Amino acid sequence: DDEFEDFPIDTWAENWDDVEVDDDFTNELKAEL
Amino acid sequence: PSLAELTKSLSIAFENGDYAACEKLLPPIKIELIKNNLLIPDLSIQNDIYLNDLMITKRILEVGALASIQTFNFDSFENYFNQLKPYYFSNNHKLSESDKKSKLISLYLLNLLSQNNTTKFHSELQYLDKHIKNLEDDSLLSYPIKLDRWLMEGSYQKAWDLLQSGSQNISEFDSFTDILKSAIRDEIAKNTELSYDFLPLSNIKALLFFNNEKETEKFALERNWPIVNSKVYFNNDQKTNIIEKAMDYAISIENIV
Amino acid sequence: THESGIKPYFEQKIQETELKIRSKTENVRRLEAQRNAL
Amino acid sequence: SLTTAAPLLALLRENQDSVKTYALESINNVVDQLWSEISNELPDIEALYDDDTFSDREMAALIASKVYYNLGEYESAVKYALAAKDRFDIDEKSQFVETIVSKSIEMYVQEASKQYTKDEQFYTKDIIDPKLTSIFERMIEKCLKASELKLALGIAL
Amino acid sequence: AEEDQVQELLKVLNEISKTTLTLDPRYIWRSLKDLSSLRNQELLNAETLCFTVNVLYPDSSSFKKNLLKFITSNHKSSVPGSAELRNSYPASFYSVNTEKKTIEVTAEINCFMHLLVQLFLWDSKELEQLVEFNRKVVIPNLLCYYNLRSLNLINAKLWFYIYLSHETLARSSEEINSDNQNIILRSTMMKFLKIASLKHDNETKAMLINLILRDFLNNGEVDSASDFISKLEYPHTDVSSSLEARYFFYLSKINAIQLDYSTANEYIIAAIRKAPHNSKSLGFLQQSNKLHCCIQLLMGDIPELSFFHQSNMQKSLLPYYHLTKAVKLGDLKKFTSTITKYKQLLLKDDTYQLCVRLRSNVIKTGIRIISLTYKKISLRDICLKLNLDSEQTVEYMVSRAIRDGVIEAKINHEDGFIETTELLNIYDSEDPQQVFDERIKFANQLHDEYLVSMRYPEDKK
Amino acid sequence: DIYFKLKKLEKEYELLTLQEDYIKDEQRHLKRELKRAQEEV
């Protein structure tokens, strides 16, 4: 059991990727023509 | 003679551009430098009398290093920088100031890049980062760092520009222009030997950053590329497999048994 | 450390032989266990 | 003091005997802290010792022996330290002296065993390297002065 | 309340006292475990160490004078008490010095008292006189004096506290003589390291190697450290797993800054596996995981974006998470924005030097993305999708990339198209041979150590 | 004194080496005779 006092604790003053969203692409401009 | 007149002569010869005269003057100085015990900045003694000659030794070594670099004496420049190392990289505020510090360190880093010793370059870059605040802000120190980063990326177009734009900015890097440009050119040649097939020589002349076709053809002949109609065609231990591995697996299985 | 002459000789060699004794005694005890079981 | 051995190392290539002597003297007192960088160019110090025209080859041999001893090759350190002759101290309080003496007597015992294997009658008055035999004899005489009769007899056996 | 603390301390010292008769490495490991336990609740407190020293150290012991000077220079409630209790305590607590025919404090006992003094000063934030003690007592009088192989582990923790206190004082304050002090400390530590290696102990050499490496890294000197470890062997015997983890982490640092990323990754994974996962070890684990992430990114492999959602380590990996996202998307603008934003946090972890080197890898992975999804792609479109400049820069980058392993492609200057070829089937070459050989090696050595550990209860059966 | 301790430790080591080689050889021949006895029974 070592306290690891040389390395201080930093101070502060089912999932993989899919971090972006496609939103409403729709793209009805093709349907315009 | 004595130290002071030797320093005066060294300074005058440097201001006159007589680098050979400076290189002649240096060996006499070092004997009395040793006699006065000034070469090693002894940290045990903090007497100001000892300190006042430390910047004199700094000046002497800086002139020695510049005389070496202007006389194509990279080895002697390395030796003088090593002798200067304790003076610069120390907490001694009176000792660790020099208007020529950035120039000397940048010259050392460019020399390290010229010897294509990238490991040494990165290690010393970490050293200088830890020992100097705001490393990237200094343009003179930024020069070798930028030349390394843009070379690692591959944007030699921004690197060959920097080498040609170095010009008078520091006025000492002109001694290193040839070797760095040669390294850039041979690196680009290595890159092109594997990527392009049937590359016209006219585009090669500008791709390799050359100036006239004759040097391009000579360089291609040095690399042994055929020049058929100016259309360069590049063309171009561990263990016995199966046996060794299977036998070793059998040995490991049966030895422990 | 300090001292020199004959005494450091025998002290160091005794230390080396003691380490050899410890490791080899452990190995011998393991081997004896397997031998006795078999 | 110094944090890197390169400052004093740059002197080791130069020509003037005075700067070589000063560099060898300075490195000897600080080789403890920086054995790695000094060990990087060990051929240079070895060649300095090899040259006969040098006026301080003994200190070069001693410093090379210290570097080798710090490395781990104790036999080469024993070989070089004996070649340092008078420069290699025998009575100073240091781990280097104790370890070099112990390894020297290691080698002396092995070589004398070989000698008595082939030349059984005697170790012979001069076959062994004179420096090693002299060191062994001086060490056992010193232990005799300290009234270590039993250990002296044992090591002689 | 002082009485119970004194009795507990005396029980601990008796536990360490048995080694003088046992002459064995045991009875000190349990002592250090109980010592950490005592420091956990501060049961050593204060004014009880003074009582213990007064009733234990005889006046003939020169160490007692300096120890009393340093623990408290004002408390003078010198209790007579057990002043006659000399033969009452077991003889393990003393030793009749034949030189002067006087009893004296046992060597291990004295070292334990000095260690306790170090611990009390460290846990009272009294750093100045802590470093004064470091430079005045333990170094010049204790460590240089006891040439015994039974001390061992005591010297390791003592050295650890010496270096830790010195570094904390040096970094915290700002003086001008710290250079010579640091040089002297490094020289002393390395001399003691050589002495310990020659005396053939194991824990002290390992701890001194760790301390020297930490000093080299904190100073910034790297190449000297790289040559230093290359000419030494870190023993794997009697060494606790914590020391191994420390050494492997520092070795990973050293091999990482010098562009040896494979070795750095292997050593950092070994360090991660060799470290305790208790809550008290969280800081070291976090500092190692940051570097593991940096090494994985720099080697080319993109870390799986779920270990960023780990335990309490998760709150500090956010800058590295954004960097990983920027690399995965291969966008130089986002990478530059993240680097500029978290520059201070990246340098405070001493990884900013490593992280700036990621700029090349961003270009490499961008070219990999635009070469895996484009059999034949116009150079202008490559430039646009790479957010870059005129055709020449793209050509230079591509020519660099294809000869640098990645992008098994081919460039033709006719009309700006990089006609990349297909990928050779990996299950047609000798690479699976190598992968399976590595796996078999690991499994076989694992089974071998498994059997060698299993074998002992056969005798214990 | 010290020399006697060194020689005694050397003798103990050498005897122990004898013991180790004995035990290894006996392990191998116990394997052999175990197979033989299993067959004989």
3-state secondary structure chain F: CHHHHHHHHHHHHHHHHHHHHHHHHHHHHHHHHHHHHHHHC
The whole-angstrom distance between residue B52's C-alpha and the CA centroid of its chain comes to 31
Q: Are F27 and C31 a contacting pair, CB within 8 Å? A: yes
The answer for B92, left when phi > 0, alpha when psi is -120 to 50, beta otherwise, is beta
Q: Are E395 and E420 a contacting pair, CB within 8 Å? A: no
Q: Which residues contact B61 (CB under 8 A, 6 or more apart)?
A: B80, B83, B84, B87
Q: Is residue B159 part of a domain?
A: yes
The whole-angstrom distance between residue E72's C-alpha and the CA centroid of its chain comes to 33
Pairwise CA distance, residues D121 & E120, whole Å: 67
Check residue E28 and report its DSSP letter.
S
Q: Write down which chains contact chain E via at least 3 CB pairs under 8 A.
A: A, B, C, D
Pairwise CA distance, residues D132 & B83, whole Å: 39
* DSSP track, D134-155: HHHHHHHHHHHHTT-HHHHHHH
Chain C CB within 8 Å of residue D105 CB: yes
Residue A5 identity (one-letter amino acid) = E
Residues comprising chain B, all counted: 257
What the block records as the tokens of D62 is 């001693």
- The dihedral formed by the CA atoms of B165, B167, B172 and B175, expressed in degrees to the nearest 10: 90
CB atoms within 10 A of CB E447: 13
Cα B22-B28-B29 angle, rounded to 5 deg: 80
Of E67, E163, E151, E78, nearest in space to E117 by CA:
E67
Report the chain C residue with the minimal C-alpha distance to residue F28: C35
Residue E203 C-alpha, separation from nearest chain A C-alpha, in angstroms:
14
D105 contacts C9? CB cut-off 8 A: yes
Q: Are E355 and E346 a contacting pair, CB within 8 Å? A: yes
Q: B231-232 and E94-97: which strand pairing?
A: unpaired
Instruction: Spell out the alpha helix ranges (H) of D3-148.
Output: 6-9, 17-30, 35-40, 42-50, 57-71, 74-83, 95-118, 130-145
Q: Are C28 and F16 a contacting pair, CB within 8 Å? A: yes
Residue E443 identity (one-letter amino acid) = A
Pairwise CA distance, residues B153 & B114, whole Å: 18
Angle between helices C7-37 and D149-156 (to 10 degrees): 70
Of E358, E370, E271, nearest in space to E320 by CA:
E358
Of E393, E395, E391, E390, nearest in space to E407 by CA:
E395
Range of the domain at B110: 6-235
Q: E417-418 and E94-97: which strand pairing?
A: unpaired
Pairwise CA distance, residues E401 & E7, whole Å: 71
Handedness of CA B208, B209, B211, B215 (dihedral sign): negative
Residue E276 has, within 13 A of its CA and on its CB side, a CA count of 12
What the block records as the tokens of C21 is 């004794």
E234: β partners: none
Of E253, E242, E181, nearest in space to E216 by CA:
E253
Handedness of CA E290, E293, E296, E300 (dihedral sign): negative
Q: D-chain residues within 8 Å CB-CB of B42? A: 1
Q: Is residue B1 part of a domain?
A: no
D102 contacts C8? CB cut-off 8 A: yes
C10 contacts F31? CB cut-off 8 A: no
Q: Is residue B126 part of a domain?
A: yes
Report the chain C residue with the minimal C-alpha distance to residue F32: C38
The SS3 assignment for E413 reads: coil
Chain A CB within 8 Å of residue E160 CB: yes
Pairwise CA distance, residues E273 & E284, whole Å: 12
Q: Are D70 and D40 a contacting pair, CB within 8 Å? A: no
Pairwise CA distance, residues E91 & E87, whole Å: 7
Chain C CB within 8 Å of residue F24 CB: yes
List phi, psi (to 5°) of E307. -70, -15
CB atoms within 10 A of CB E343: 15
Chain C CB within 8 Å of residue E458 CB: yes
B200: β partners: B231
Report the chain C residue with the minimal C-alpha distance to residue E451: C30
Chain B CB within 8 Å of residue E185 CB: no
Residue E199 identity (one-letter amino acid) = K
D4 contacts B82? CB cut-off 8 A: yes
List phi, psi (to 5°) of E94. -145, -175
Resolution of the experimentally solved model in angstroms? 3.6
Pairwise CA distance, residues E424 & E182, whole Å: 56
Helix (H) or strand (E) holding B200, with range, is strand B199-200
Q: Is residue B216 part of a domain?
A: yes
Instruction: Spell out the alpha helix ranges (H) of chain B.
Output: 3-15, 19-35, 48-70, 74-88, 101-114, 118-131, 139-153, 156-166, 177-195, 201-207, 213-222, 243-256
The answer for A8, left when phi > 0, alpha when psi is -120 to 50, beta otherwise, is beta
Residue D78 C-alpha, separation from nearest chain E C-alpha, in angstroms:
15
Pairwise CA distance, residues D101 & D85, whole Å: 13
Angle between helices F2-40 and D149-156 (to 10 degrees): 50
Q: Are E213 and E254 a contacting pair, CB within 8 Å? A: yes
The answer for E90, left when phi > 0, alpha when psi is -120 to 50, beta otherwise, is beta
E417: β partners: E378, E412
Q: Are D86 and D59 a contacting pair, CB within 8 Å? A: no
Pairwise CA distance, residues A15 & A6, whole Å: 35
Nearest CB among F5, F10, F27 relative to C34 is that of F27
Pairwise CA distance, residues C17 & B257, whole Å: 30
Report the chain E residue with the minimal C-alpha distance to residue C2: E147
Report the chain A residue with the minimal C-alpha distance to residue E30: A1
Interface test with E, best of C7, C14, C15 (most E CBs within 10 A): C15
Pairwise CA distance, residues B239 & D4, whole Å: 41
Q: Which residues contact D116 (CB under 8 A, 6 or more apart)?
A: D123
Residue C1 C-alpha, separation from nearest chain E C-alpha, in angstroms:
7
What the block records as the tokens of B240 is 């016995």
C3 contacts D101? CB cut-off 8 A: no
Handedness of CA D20, D25, D28, D33 (dihedral sign): negative
Q: Is residue B253 part of a domain?
A: no
List phi, psi (to 5°) of E97. -70, 110
Chain C CB within 8 Å of residue F17 CB: yes
Burial class (CB in 10 A: 0-12, 13-18, 19+), D84: buried
E102: β partners: E97
Check residue E315 and report its DSSP letter.
G
Q: Is residue B251 part of a domain?
A: no
Q: Is residue B240 part of a domain?
A: no
Instruction: Enumerate long-range contacts of E315-321, CB under 8 Å, 24 or more apart.
Output: E315/A12, E316/A10, E316/E286, E316/E290, E317/E289, E317/E290, E317/E293, E319/E345, E319/E346, E320/E290, E320/E293, E320/E294
The SS3 assignment for C1 reads: coil
Q: F-chain residues within 8 Å CB-CB of C35? A: 23, 26-27, 30
Q: Is residue B204 part of a domain?
A: yes
B232: β partners: B199
Residues comprising chain F, all counted: 41
Pairwise CA distance, residues E268 & E296, whole Å: 10
Pairwise CA distance, residues D51 & D49, whole Å: 6
Residues comprising chain E, all counted: 461
Residue B68 identity (one-letter amino acid) = S
Interface test with E, best of A1, A16, A19 (most E CBs within 10 A): A1
Pairwise CA distance, residues D47 & D61, whole Å: 10
Number of domains present in the structure of chain B: 1
Pairwise CA distance, residues E373 & E14, whole Å: 73
Pairwise CA distance, residues B80 & E278, whole Å: 51
Radius of gyration of chain F (CA): 18
Give the C-alpha distances (Å, rounded to integers) separating E232 from B82, D35, E197: 25, 12, 10
Interface test with F, best of C3, C11, C24, C27 (most F CBs within 10 A): C24
Radius of gyration of chain D (CA): 18
Check residue A1 and report its DSSP letter.
-
The SS3 assignment for E411 reads: strand
Check residue A9 and report its DSSP letter.
P
List phi, psi (to 5°) of D25. -65, -45
Pairwise CA distance, residues B160 & B206, whole Å: 12
Give the C-alpha distances (Å, rounded to integers) separating E296 from A18, B1, E256, E267, E327: 21, 61, 11, 12, 12
The answer for A15, left when phi > 0, alpha when psi is -120 to 50, beta otherwise, is beta
Beta strands in E49-168 (DSSP E): 94-97, 102-105
Q: What is the largest CA-CA distance in chain A?
A: 73
Pairwise CA distance, residues D151 & C10, whole Å: 9
- The dihedral formed by the CA atoms of B15, B16, B19 and B24, expressed in degrees to the nearest 10: -100
What the block records as the tokens of E324 is 């990983």
Burial string for A1-33 (b: 16+ CB within 10 Å, else e) reads: ebebebbeebeeeeeeeeeeeeeeeeeeeeeee
Check residue A8 and report its DSSP letter.
P
Q: F-chain residues within 8 Å CB-CB of C28? A: 16, 19-20, 23
User: Position of tokens 């914590």?
Assistant: E242
What the block records as the tokens of D31 is 């080789």
Q: Are B140 and B102 a contacting pair, CB within 8 Å? A: yes
Residues 137-156 of B with CB under 8 A from E: 149, 152-156
Helix (H) or strand (E) holding E162, with range, is helix E153-172
Query: Taking chain C, what is the end-to-end CA distance rounded to the nearest angstrom?
Result: 49
Chains A and F touch, using 3 or more CB pairs below 8 Å: no
What the block records as the tokens of C6 is 């004959």
Burial class (CB in 10 A: 0-12, 13-18, 19+), B48: exposed
Pairwise CA distance, residues E434 & B242, whole Å: 10
CB atoms within 10 A of CB D15: 7
Of B19, B6, B147, nearest in space to B77 by CA:
B19
Chains B and A touch, using 3 or more CB pairs below 8 Å: no
